[PDB]
Design an enzyme around this catalytic site. Sequence first.
Site, PDB file in Angstrom:
ATOM      1  N   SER A 109       3.141  -0.082   3.203  1.00 26.21           N
ATOM      2  CA  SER A 109       3.740   1.340   3.479  1.00 26.21           C
ATOM      3  C   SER A 109       3.964   2.025   2.110  1.00 26.21           C
ATOM      4  CB  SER A 109       4.850   1.806   4.267  1.00 26.21           C
ATOM      5  OG  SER A 109       4.900   3.292   4.593  1.00 26.21           O
ATOM      6  N   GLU A 110       5.267   0.794   1.359  1.00 22.33           N
ATOM      7  CA  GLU A 110       5.280   0.650  -0.023  1.00 22.33           C
ATOM      8  C   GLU A 110       5.844   0.149  -0.353  1.00 22.33           C
ATOM      9  OE1 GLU A 110       5.722   5.587   0.912  1.00 22.33           O
ATOM     10  OE2 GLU A 110       6.915   3.664   2.220  1.00 22.33           O
ATOM     11  N   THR A 111       6.001  -0.565  -1.561  1.00 18.11           N
ATOM     12  CA  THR A 111       6.145  -1.633  -2.610  1.00 18.11           C
ATOM     13  C   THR A 111       6.791  -1.424  -2.972  1.00 18.11           C
ATOM     14  OG1 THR A 111       4.016  -2.824  -2.277  1.00 18.11           O
ATOM     15  CG2 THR A 111       5.521  -3.988  -3.943  1.00 18.11           C
TER      16      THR A 111
END
Length: 260
Positions: free
Chosen positions: A45-47
């Site tokens: 999803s997000e890093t």
Amino acid sequence: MSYPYYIVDAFAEEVFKGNPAAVYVLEKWLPEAVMQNIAIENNLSETAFTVKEGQSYALRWFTPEREIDLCGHATLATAFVLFNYYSVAEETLHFTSQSGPLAVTKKEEYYYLDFPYILPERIPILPEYEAALGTKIYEAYLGRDLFFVLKDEETVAKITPDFSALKALDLGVGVIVTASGDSVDFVSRTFFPKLRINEDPVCGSAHANLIPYWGKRLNQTTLSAYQVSPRGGFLTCEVKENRVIIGGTAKLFAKGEAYL
């Protein structure tokens, strides 16, 4: 060559639940390109990438597409790993993002994020809305996202929206659906087809509209919530004057090292 990383499910009591994010605590900043490539690579999803700058931690979020202005679950995640693996003694972490200073507070196994108090304003209930959702919308409002109130928790959980139909709606960035919880104060689900993300398991920023609405309607300062996505996610909510607070647990899925 070796860069430690963590994969945590934010707002989850156990793995496979909540909302997943990868967090990299770096000793210095990597080039923009490399950080983008890492986000594409793990395809999560997000890093989130962070680096201690003085007494604050400079945050940076990236999705597989590009860098975003802010993402709540990933902030909670970054906080979670700093609190549990980088020995921060203080009960509150201070970040220096591109969207201004952010703070997460650890109280027991919960991490608290703060969001603006934005009560969504009434909007006309268009039939094309109920069409995409595939259910009856009792109330409608607008904020950053469309905000529909449904029959009950069973209905919120059960729906399967026509995501291509929702992406077509003119108002908002996303779509929020809510209803009285069966064992909790209120439940929700958030869809963002306009942003490639069909359904966020738990968008905390959405609670800027959710919390105000349910606090006013239920007449409470504190509320229990549960974003009933497939993955699920619990949130302890609090209403403050001009600000809302969400607290959630977290779970480490994996820990390792990336090589560059």
